[PDB]
Design an enzyme around this catalytic site. Structure first.
Site, PDB file in Angstrom:
ATOM      1  N   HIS A 123     -17.888 -25.586  44.267  1.00  0.00           N
ATOM      2  CA  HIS A 123     -17.950 -25.392  42.822  1.00  0.00           C
ATOM      3  C   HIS A 123     -18.725 -24.136  42.433  1.00  0.00           C
ATOM      4  CE1 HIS A 123     -16.980 -29.911  41.838  1.00  0.00           C
ATOM      5  NE2 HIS A 123     -15.903 -29.199  42.120  1.00  0.00           N
ATOM      6  N   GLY A 214     -24.526 -39.040  47.838  1.00  0.00           N
ATOM      7  CA  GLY A 214     -24.787 -38.811  46.421  1.00  0.00           C
ATOM      8  C   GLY A 214     -23.610 -38.470  45.526  1.00  0.00           C
ATOM      9  N   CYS A 258     -30.485 -41.277  48.573  1.00  0.00           N
ATOM     10  CA  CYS A 258     -30.134 -40.613  49.825  1.00  0.00           C
ATOM     11  C   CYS A 258     -31.352 -39.989  50.502  1.00  0.00           C
ATOM     12  CB  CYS A 258     -29.035 -39.584  49.581  1.00  0.00           C
ATOM     13  SG  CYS A 258     -29.555 -38.207  48.551  1.00  0.00           S
TER      14      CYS A 258
HETATM   15  N1  LIG Z   1     -30.808 -40.424  44.097  1.00  0.00           N
HETATM   16  C1  LIG Z   1     -29.573 -40.625  44.544  1.00  0.00           C
HETATM   17  N2  LIG Z   1     -29.297 -40.768  45.852  1.00  0.00           N
HETATM   18  C2  LIG Z   1     -27.970 -40.991  46.239  1.00  0.00           C
HETATM   19  N3  LIG Z   1     -26.992 -41.045  45.235  1.00  0.00           N
HETATM   20  C3  LIG Z   1     -27.349 -40.889  43.948  1.00  0.00           C
HETATM   21  C4  LIG Z   1     -28.626 -40.682  43.610  1.00  0.00           C
HETATM   22  N4  LIG Z   1     -28.694 -40.561  42.284  1.00  0.00           N
HETATM   23  C5  LIG Z   1     -27.459 -40.693  41.802  1.00  0.00           C
HETATM   24  N5  LIG Z   1     -26.632 -40.909  42.826  1.00  0.00           N
HETATM   25  C6  LIG Z   1     -25.166 -41.081  42.714  1.00  0.00           C
HETATM   26  O1  LIG Z   1     -24.673 -39.743  42.612  1.00  0.00           O
HETATM   27  C7  LIG Z   1     -23.409 -39.812  41.892  1.00  0.00           C
HETATM   28  C8  LIG Z   1     -23.486 -38.800  40.738  1.00  0.00           C
HETATM   29  O2  LIG Z   1     -22.145 -38.416  40.387  1.00  0.00           O
HETATM   30  P1  LIG Z   1     -21.801 -37.240  39.315  1.00  0.00           P
HETATM   31  O3  LIG Z   1     -22.912 -37.168  38.331  1.00  0.00           O
HETATM   32  O4  LIG Z   1     -20.417 -37.433  38.834  1.00  0.00           O
HETATM   33  O5  LIG Z   1     -21.857 -35.926  40.260  1.00  0.00           O
HETATM   34  P2  LIG Z   1     -20.768 -35.603  41.418  1.00  0.00           P
HETATM   35  O6  LIG Z   1     -19.499 -35.099  40.558  1.00  0.00           O
HETATM   36  O7  LIG Z   1     -21.293 -34.458  42.194  1.00  0.00           O
HETATM   37  O8  LIG Z   1     -20.420 -36.857  42.125  1.00  0.00           O
HETATM   38  C9  LIG Z   1     -23.313 -41.265  41.400  1.00  0.00           C
HETATM   39  O9  LIG Z   1     -22.655 -42.035  42.391  1.00  0.00           O
HETATM   40  C10 LIG Z   1     -24.773 -41.651  41.386  1.00  0.00           C
HETATM   41  O10 LIG Z   1     -24.942 -43.093  41.408  1.00  0.00           O
END
Ligand SMILES: Nc1ncnc2c1ncn2[C@@H]1O[C@H](COP(=O)(O)OP(=O)(O)O)[C@@H](O)[C@H]1O
Ligand SMILES: [Zn+2]
Length: 267
Positions: A123, A214, A258
């Site tokens: 991206h 994530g 993560c």
């Molecule tokens: N601290 C974390 N560790 C692992 N996963 C996370 C964490 N915080 C958020 N997530 C997950 O990361 C994802 C965020 O997705 P999004 O905001 O659409 O970005 P992307 O398009 O990069 O996936 C969701 O599944 C959220 O639950």
């Protein structure tokens, strides 16, 4: 999906070509604002509003104000234990003649800051520009990127628009161009770079282990990299705080931040 760290470790011990797909959850752990959810705004908009061709065509100054703020806040953000476990894994396995590649949706460069060398940023990056006239891409770390943006980008609701004339926004320095620069970031509705996707496809075709870390797994085409991998029978392990629509299509699912699960998994 399985939650056996022991079983994942048995695959990890044997894998020679690991693909790690990372999404905004890895950046969220460093306190990097995503402006995606759940109510994450910059003053009155979210990323869905400003990271678009529409937004840049109507109000390029406001889009640059937004990206300027994001560039500036990175000065106070550092890689987290997830970034570091991923980078150390690459370096350690590299000594053994084993390959680790990171394919990231994130634009904040924290994977690089942690030491990752084998990185595909699908991206773009907050720290690259692209000229809207000649198309040249360049690295740019300058604070502020241009004088007119000095002190601008404040995120508080009610903050007035800087309304910088387009000639005072970042301009291409290529001899004879002088065109308007945009962030070299893929915006919603735009096509990803075919050459980068060619590299992604080569890694997905050769890996023997794949981690998805994530990622909400609804943004395309990135939400369809891991299914192609599992089809060949290679294990896919998901590290996320919550199940996604793609959860039951993976071999492992390890719930939690993560930065808590990755150091153990990649140890
Ligand atoms: N601290 C974390 N560790 C692992 N996963 C996370 C964490 N915080 C958020 N997530 C997950 O990361 C994802 C965020 O997705 P999004 O905001 O659409 O970005 P992307 O398009 O990069 O996936 C969701 O599944 C959220 O639950
Ligand atoms: Zn140019």
């Amino acid at each position: 999906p399985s939650s056996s760290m022991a079983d994942f470790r048995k695959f990890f011990a044997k894998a020679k070509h690991i693909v790690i797909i990372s999404g905004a959850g890895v950046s969220a752990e460093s306190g990097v604002p995503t402006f995606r959810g759940a109510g994450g705004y910059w003053r009155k908009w979210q990323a869905q509003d400003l990271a678009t061709p529409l937004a840049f065509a109507h109000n390029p100054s406001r889009v640059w104000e937004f990206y300027h703020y994001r560039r500036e806040v990175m000065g106070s953000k550092e890689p987290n234990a997830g970034h570091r476990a991923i980078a150390e894994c690459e370096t350690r396995l590299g000594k053994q003649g084993r390959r680790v590649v990171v394919i990231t949706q994130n634009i904040d460069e924290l994977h690089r800051k942690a030491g990752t060398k084998n990185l595909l940023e699908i991206h773009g990056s907050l720290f690259k520009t692209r000229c809207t006239s000649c198309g040249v891409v360049a690295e740019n770390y300058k604070s502020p990127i241009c004088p007119a943006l000095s002190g601008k980008g404040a995120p508080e609701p009610g903050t007035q628009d800087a309304s910088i004339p387009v000639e005072k926004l970042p301009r291409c320095e290529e001899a004879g161009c002088g065109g308007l620069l945009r962030p070299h970031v893929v915006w919603f509705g735009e096509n990803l770079d075919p050459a980068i996707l060619e590299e992604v496809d080569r890694e997905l075709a050769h890996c023997d282990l794949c981690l998805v870390v994530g990622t909400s797994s609804v943004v395309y085409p990135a939400a369809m990299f891991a299914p192609q991998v599992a089809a060949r029978g290679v294990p896919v392990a998901e590290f996320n705080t919550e199940t996604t629509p793609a959860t039951n299509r993976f071999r492992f699912h390890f719930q939690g931040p993560c930065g808590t699960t990755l150091p153990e998994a990649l140890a």
